[PDB]
Amino acid sequence: MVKLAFPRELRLLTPSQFTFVFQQPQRAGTPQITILGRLNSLGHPRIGLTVAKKNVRRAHERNRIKRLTRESFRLRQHELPAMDFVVVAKKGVADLDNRALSEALEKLWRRHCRLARGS
């Protein structure tokens, strides 16, 4: 609802981070590339970019997408917290130009950054 700390910590949670993030992900990102946010202070910041073959149909550009995302998360280490970030690239992110990939980077960056400073 408002407070991210739910009393379900008294309940047996699953160690499945993929499931855990997908249950309650704070959606902040471009409609064609969904950067989810899992409020979890583990101390282990990981980038879990998940993409389907229907979403990125161009085989080589699949590597392009994982390049763009992962290389950004390795350089924007100041802005991101130590949480679980399973990013789901939607069908359409691979419709952009190689130039436009970087052009959309600052869009999703600032988008989620504004939310990471809030709650």
Side-chain angles (χ1 to χ4, degrees):
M1 293 64 177
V2 182
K3 191 164 68 70
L4 279 303
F6 290 87
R8 58 178 58 212
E9 54 173 81
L10 287 73
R11 187 55 45 209
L12 302 182
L13 68 165
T14 42
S16 308
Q17 54 84 214
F18 183 78
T19 309
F20 188 56
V21 61
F22 195 75
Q23 295 307 91
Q24 185 187 90
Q26 299 308 91
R27 200 284 292 221
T30 322
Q32 53 178 270
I33 175 176
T34 311
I35 299 79
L36 292 316
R38 177 80 298 269
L39 291 310
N40 177 31
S41 186
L42 210 291
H44 186 106
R46 74 167 309 213
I47 181 186
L49 180 61
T50 304
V51 61
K53 186 182 179 182
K54 55 168 298 189
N55 294 27
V56 177
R57 192 61 183 179
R58 209 63 186 166
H60 291 178
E61 302 313 286
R62 176 198 61 139
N63 296 29
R64 199 87 60 197
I65 301 302
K66 299 211 292 183
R67 256 189 174 249
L68 212 295
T69 47
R70 181 176 57 186
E71 191 127 89
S72 299
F73 278 68
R74 75 191 301 208
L75 297 178
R76 300 264 46 129
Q77 195 66 210
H78 302 128
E79 297 69 41
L80 53 84
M83 299 180 181
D84 181 87
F85 296 104
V86 174
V87 182
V88 183
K90 302 276 79 178
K91 198 286 299 183
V93 63
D95 193 87
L96 297 181
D97 183 273
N98 186 33
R99 166 180 53 155
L101 298 177
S102 305
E103 299 292 88
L105 179 60
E106 64 107 289
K107 309 303 299 191
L108 57 87
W109 174 58
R110 173 172 289 139
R111 170 67 73 176
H112 207 113
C113 187
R114 189 73 64 201
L115 190 62
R117 304 298 290 183
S119 185

